[PDB]
Amino acid sequence: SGIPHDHYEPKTGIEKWLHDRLPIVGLVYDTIMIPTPKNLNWWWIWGIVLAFTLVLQIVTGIVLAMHYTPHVDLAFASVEHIMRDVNGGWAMRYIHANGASLFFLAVYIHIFRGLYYGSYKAPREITWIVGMVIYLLMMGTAFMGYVLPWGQMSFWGATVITGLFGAIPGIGPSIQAWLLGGPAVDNATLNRFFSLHYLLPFVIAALVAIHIWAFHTTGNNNPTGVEVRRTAEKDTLPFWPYFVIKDLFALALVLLGFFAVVAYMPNYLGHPDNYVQANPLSTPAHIVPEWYFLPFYAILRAFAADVWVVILVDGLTFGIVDAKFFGVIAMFGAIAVMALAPWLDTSKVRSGAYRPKFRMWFWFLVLDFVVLTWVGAMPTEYPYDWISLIASTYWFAYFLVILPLLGATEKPEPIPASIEEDF
Amino acid sequence: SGIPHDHYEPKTGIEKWLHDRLPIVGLVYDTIMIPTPKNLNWWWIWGIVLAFTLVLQIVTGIVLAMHYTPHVDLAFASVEHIMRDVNGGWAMRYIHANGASLFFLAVYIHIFRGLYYGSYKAPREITWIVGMVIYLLMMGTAFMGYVLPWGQMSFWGATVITGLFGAIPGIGPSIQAWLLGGPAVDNATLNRFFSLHYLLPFVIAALVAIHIWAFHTTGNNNPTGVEVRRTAEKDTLPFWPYFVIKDLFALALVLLGFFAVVAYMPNYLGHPDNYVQANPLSTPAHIVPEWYFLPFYAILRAFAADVWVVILVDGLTFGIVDAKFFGVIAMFGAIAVMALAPWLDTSKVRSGAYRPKFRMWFWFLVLDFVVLTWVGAMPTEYPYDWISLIASTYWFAYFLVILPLLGATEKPEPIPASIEEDF
Amino acid sequence: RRDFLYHATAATGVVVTGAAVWPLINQMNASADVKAMASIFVDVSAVEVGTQLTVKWRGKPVFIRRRDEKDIELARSVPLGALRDTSAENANKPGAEATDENRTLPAFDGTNTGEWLVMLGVCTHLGCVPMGDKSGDFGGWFCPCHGSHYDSAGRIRKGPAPRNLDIPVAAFVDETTIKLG
Amino acid sequence: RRDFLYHATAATGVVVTGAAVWPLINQMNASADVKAMASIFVDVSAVEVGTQLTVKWRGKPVFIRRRDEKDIELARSVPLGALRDTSAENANKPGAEATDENRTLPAFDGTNTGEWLVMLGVCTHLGCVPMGDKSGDFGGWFCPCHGSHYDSAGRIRKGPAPRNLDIPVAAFVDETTIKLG
Amino acid sequence: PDHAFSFEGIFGKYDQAQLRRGFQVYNEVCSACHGMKFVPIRTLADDGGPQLDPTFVREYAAGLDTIIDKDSGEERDRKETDMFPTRVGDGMGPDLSVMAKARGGPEYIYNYVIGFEENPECAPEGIDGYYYNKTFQIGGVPDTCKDAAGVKITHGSWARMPPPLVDDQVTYEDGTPATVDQMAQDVSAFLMWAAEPKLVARKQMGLVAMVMLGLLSVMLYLTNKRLWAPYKGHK
Amino acid sequence: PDHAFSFEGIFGKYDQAQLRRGFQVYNEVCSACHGMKFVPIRTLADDGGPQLDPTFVREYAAGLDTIIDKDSGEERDRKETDMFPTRVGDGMGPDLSVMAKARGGPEYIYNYVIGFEENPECAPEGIDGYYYNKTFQIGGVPDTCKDAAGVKITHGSWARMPPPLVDDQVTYEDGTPATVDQMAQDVSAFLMWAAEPKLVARKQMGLVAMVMLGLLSVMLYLTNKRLWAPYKGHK
Ligand code: HEC
Ligand code: HEC
Ligand code: HEC
Ligand code: HEC
Ligand code: HEC
Ligand code: HEC
Ligand code: FES
Ligand code: FES
């Protein structure tokens, strides 16, 4: 059971004088020969993808910062200095910019893999909490970063996603001014964002430290509602070399596609308007902040008192909870409820591979995510308003009511024993 | 023996559900209730001082970077923007600038405490190695940082301490250009230095991580040549609350003095010429890089073929080893030999409190350090040249020959037993 | 005493910690160079009355647009009913009803109001810049960030934006100038 | 085979890693905007021959100083013996001996050398700027960074600096100009 | 058909004669109003695009406007190391440094320059000082051409730029019919260069990396199939 | 004796009348050649120093040179938000923004302005265009005054600045003998302000922190003495 196999430091004198600093003991006993089940599909790779992508972003950023100058008058020029003069330039920038896209794409699949195979269910709450914390940090990071080029979309995205904090009453304008460094956006905001943007990744790495510490102490989830049967465990092959090699193969494929993009379709995920300098006096059409924030942008700009299911007219009972504040609360709740999940699913069961109704609702949820992604880009004119309202309502409904009802009446399936599934 | 007292997680349900993430187990069992001897004097505090100073510097820097603009045309102006407009300004800058001074002062006492009480002697080699690595990183950091204000001393200090790398043959100019971003100093160097300067502290923290991991696995030295007698150990009170409170008291005193300086004598340790903008066309008199690099500056500019003990005329046997390269090697060796110490002292003994000859030689070494500090500021005219040569020669002599001879014939003292020294 | 001394040491440590933390949260506030926040003299100077005029100030645009009769009549024909924000955000006067007579502007040092209207070109939803030049579904301004329809006089309509376009404190400089501040 | 396949996978991984690392070490090299490194036309234009003239170029100063007879005679009276660097660093000619006849400069398009001397104002020790205007213990230049005494013609003396002050490639523009590059 | 360029694909390293033609046009036509500050003059020798002769570059540079200085205010000789000039206002337009990315890009410029036909049969009078363009979409439209809800019934809108070229505005030294269409294509390619000069290097890097990573991935697949063999053989 | 200032110590928050006098002196004498770019004009209302009336500040600002713009080249009215002007060359000197720190500082300025006496009895002819000072140390010296190894025998050296003031150059509105010494002291204090405006806040913070930390340290000493009591009582 949970064989650590510390190696007893019996190799030789080198492995015996290393009794001063244990380090190799840690690596070997724990982070390399960690028994993992055999039943792992191709959905348990994306964590390696995320770690590599994080390293990539940190490196490329440390390189760019050697040529980026945070200032309204010299940011655009420095970015062009990069893409033209520097030796590698375009590569670093395109790899930095697009890799953010892959990062978020990979976390999406990392998260939805989790919702299916009960990875939030006990005893794996801490991992979930830490993951939501990370998600928040990395969203804030990417936001701070999209601003640095001082293009045109930078300015206005910052403007609105800071007016949010100002929507709330009493302490809105104060926070807004304390965050922007002033009444509106200017170089001060740029300096804050650069610093902050150059600091959070390390916090993320530490949090990834705790993320990895947790699911090593707590066994990796597995396609089944079963554990490694610790009591000797013919199942649960080790990590190295088997799963290391599997993950590296998938990672090679992913990097292949990523570099093909970088080299042929690099400006595809971007907004052309970010290639024109900023004008605080003129706003372009369809700001469309980005593609990894459209869901929450839509959940925000949906509630506007423009439907018979408009709960804003009812929330107006209290004269303080206006629309804006309502949408902001709705977004914060869209995330808080995803974090609260493990204490809402009242099921003494596990992976939805044995819960059909859950399968249907979950695929509807994935569809809802895609729809929200597609709607945040389209105007607030009919019919898109009804669509956004329906989708947000279903998100909240799933995460609040649907899981309890299932946990109550959702066991028409024969659960599998013997995690050694030699089929 | 080595009582960890994991606490068994018997407190309550909170301390029992924390069996998902051990964290509190680590803190309690290891990093708080770490048995430390009773025989500790006031020289075992400076590590807490260093940790706090590092945190202070990191914080103040993260704040400054919100207003500093890396560019030749806007650095000085941004520094003045800080010291005038910003709310706190002068405080952050003076605390950042002077705290570096305290940092190095504190590491000096941390290191010399070590040389006395055989803290480099086995089984504490890894700590020593890691400490020298750190010292290097933090020297490089402070150097990169003194440049950012783009004053006058910045430029020329950078110029010379980069011409060093160019002294060596074959791969000197290439490295020089690859480090400066060009033939000479300009904005590119500034960007590199800012980035680098804003990144190494985290590496230092990690290295401090390993630094703290090591001497927790390996017992804290103690005033004597004795261990905690693991086999139950009435000696070795715990860290918390006793030594925590002692260190915090000393730290309060130190911060008191430090803030008195910051508020009354802040520009004392500085160079006024760093308050005039840079002129690549005019060099001031007595550049005098700083005060924590004068020893090595002197060891460098001492060997010049201007004494009957001039080994440069002899090293000229090989036409490649000229003077400059000789001084550079001498400096790198001045540090490498301090790192090699634990394998040069051939003594099966410990703290020099029981080795008189060692006491005398060690106080001579401290005097040599002070002298080198005082000499790097004075010209290379007679008699200072002879002084610098003598001092460097004694440094090398100590660390190479003196310790072996002692380890041979240096045991006229009764060693103390029973680390419980109830005198 | 055990309790008193221990708790007092803890309290003093906490107080010092807070006194050290506050400035790390104060430096991010508006600095003195941002404190200035003063006025601007924009000269109307025959810009062909009826299309628009925009000028930068305080980091935001200040819209100075003449009036087109059709725009005017549409304005003056708006009863307070069915008007989201009837407060006439203009700070040059009290909270008087959001009426075009009060909402257009001072009268050149003369006596007339249905000819000029200078408001802050900042959407009250989240601070975007609406597009002018007769746009939207009400012959006024349209915000492209979320779709808020403004009217001729600038009062909010058809969108999430809660209130109309504010009007800063401004007076005239004897028939060719505007004072913003 | 076990050995072949495993070792080949490792080799390919290593190769890819290196191909990815190299640019992270290449970007820090001089960029194309630093590649330029071209020439400058400085006009002597009667600056009162005998004191000095300094101009910025390539990020370093280029010293153009006329000659003072006492400085000249001290120069021409220096035998190659007791001269640290006798190579005449000047790149406008071969490695001919560091003699004042070759070491002063071209002759205005005429025939004379003991009147002008333009060298690179960069100490060969570590690149500091020596102080001019008759300084040091040899009536020339003095480096304040470590104490290197230069002579009248710029040849190094009395210090760690190994070689004299180099002389870039320069020709005259017909009696009032200098071409640096 | 769509008149695809050379670079439109996995290959097509910027046929350079096209770019020299675009340069002949840009400096003689578009430069009168437009600028390219984000473009150094020394790039007309760098590989990939117009590999002109450096000496001609220095000549053409000295023959341009006067960019004064950064240290001592004095009208210099506009050395190549400087950037192309900037036309800012009073009847002038934006900067074309990266206009090929702020819009499939070059096709916009081609189909924009192409198309300035007379005013349609909805508003033949048109507007004073504004001219009509088939493809610009961010211009004003008269009320006579708008529908019932503000949308325009015209394909394009009214742009403030006049027609830049006639039937035979300039001569090509290489020998080629210099009609409007060829000039438009050429200048579009030149602007795409000015925006993406490092295109060919992009493509070559992409090829090299695709190849090396396919190799690595194949080898890893073999290693995986091997290691996992004794556990996937009976089923 | 040494004519210590007010701020020379643990107290001395910049007696403001002295600074107003120094301002009368600086704008009417030193400003002709020197500048203070690193100094905003609005600081003449901020506390600590000259708490002048804002309206006078705006007037004095509009009455200065013309600082053109940063966005649209056009000679503006020079609003207070801008910085003091800059005199750069052609018989002009450095910037006095932080000259009080690039040298005990203000004493240098006092003992420098003080001292321009005639040429000594080693070189009475002196030099053409250069004037003599007894305290500047970074100026040239004639060969007649140097020793055998280049060192000067004079106290100071020859500075390019002329004597700035005579016996009664300007009047003080408050009523005070405006001799040279008082003006020198006043202008020195003004420059020290221009360099260290946040001095008084520095001192008050230092006091507060010394106090709080002494308190904390005393309490920790008591706690230590207590905890370590049962182990240090028999000896
Ligand atoms: C002045 C006589 C011009 C010359 C000659 C050329 N251009 Fe221009 N251009 C000019 C103006 C005033 C504008 C702004 C138009 C507006 O309505 O805002 C432009 C615009 C362009 C654009 C941008 C179009 C867009 O979608 O915003 C392009 C791509 C452009 N012009 C191209 C172009 C070329 C290739 C030229 C030389 C052949 C050229 N223009 C000449 C003014 C003038
Ligand atoms: C031109 C007529 C001047 C006026 C009036 C004032 N100053 Fe000046 N100053 C001037 C020059 C050309 C120089 C450079 C001198 C040199 O030899 O390099 C200076 C220098 C100073 C300095 C710096 C001295 C030093 O050690 O470098 C100071 C502190 C100074 N001047 C002060 C000063 C004051 C207070 C004035 C008004 C009372 C003033 N100067 C007027 C030119 C001129
Ligand atoms: C060491 C510095 C650094 C790190 C670490 C870093 N970046 Fe950046 N980032 C930059 C710089 C510099 C820019 C501006 C240059 C650019 O846009 O490429 C930038 C810009 C961006 C952009 C906008 C790209 C563009 O071209 O508009 C995004 C998105 C972004 N960062 C996201 C991230 C995310 C997400 C992470 C990690 C979680 C990250 N970055 C890590 C330095 C860094
Ligand atoms: C909001 C949720 C969430 C986020 C965001 C998240 N994780 Fe996870 N992660 C999980 C969960 C749940 C598991 C499953 C743990 C288990 O099975 O015991 C997991 C597992 C892992 C694993 C091991 C198994 C696997 O799925 O590969 C790795 C490695 C990992 N995460 C890395 C990362 C990294 C690196 C990041 C970010 C840079 C990240 N994760 C972000 C929740 C998250
Ligand atoms: C987050 C950024 C950051 C960190 C971390 C940081 N600094 Fe700095 N440092 C700066 C900035 C910004 C400046 C320039 C402003 C200034 O000089 O105060 C600077 C300047 C300096 C200076 C010159 C001070 C002066 O005023 O001339 C020194 C010395 C220095 N740093 C040393 C250090 C050392 C040693 C460390 C930690 C080991 C450190 N710094 C940590 C940001 C930082
Ligand atoms: C080059 C040597 C060196 C450097 C530099 C150094 N250390 Fe140490 N450190 C030591 C040695 C040796 C010991 C003694 C360990 C023992 O007694 O087991 C030690 C002990 C310590 C201790 C515990 C006992 C004590 O002396 O306080 C702390 C805490 C500590 N170091 C922190 C730091 C921090 C933080 C830094 C830098 C930011 C640092 N040290 C830099 C060598 C070094
Ligand atoms: S920001 Fe103006 S409507 Fe959303
Ligand atoms: S740098 Fe010129 S002598 Fe040391």
Residue numbers in the entry:
A (entry chain P), B (entry chain C): 2 to 232, 237 to 428
C (entry chain R), D (entry chain E): 11 to 191
E (entry chain Q), F (entry chain D): 5 to 107, 126 to 257
From the primary publication:
CIII2 is a dimer with each monomer comprised of three subunits: the Rieske FeS (FeS) protein with a [2Fe-2S] cluster, cyt b with hemes bH and bL, and cyt c1 with heme c1 cofactors. The FeS protein external domain (FeS-ED) is mobile between the b (close to heme bL) and c (close to heme c1) positions. In R. capsulatus, both the diffusible cyt c2 and the membrane-anchored cyt cy carry electrons from CIII2 to CIV in respiration. Here we report the cryo-electron microscopic (cryo-EM) structure of this functional bc1-cbb3-type SC (CIII2CIV, at 5.2 Å resolution), together with three structural conformers of native CIII2 (at 3.3–4.2 Å resolution).
The bipartite SC + cy samples also contained smaller particles (~110 Å length) that were the size of CIII2 Supplementary. Analyses of these particles using C2 symmetry led to the map CIII2 at 3.3 Å resolution for native CIII2, with local resolutions ranging from 3.0 to 4.0 Å. The FeS-ED parts showed lower occupancy and resolution compared to the rest of the map, indicating conformational heterogeneity.
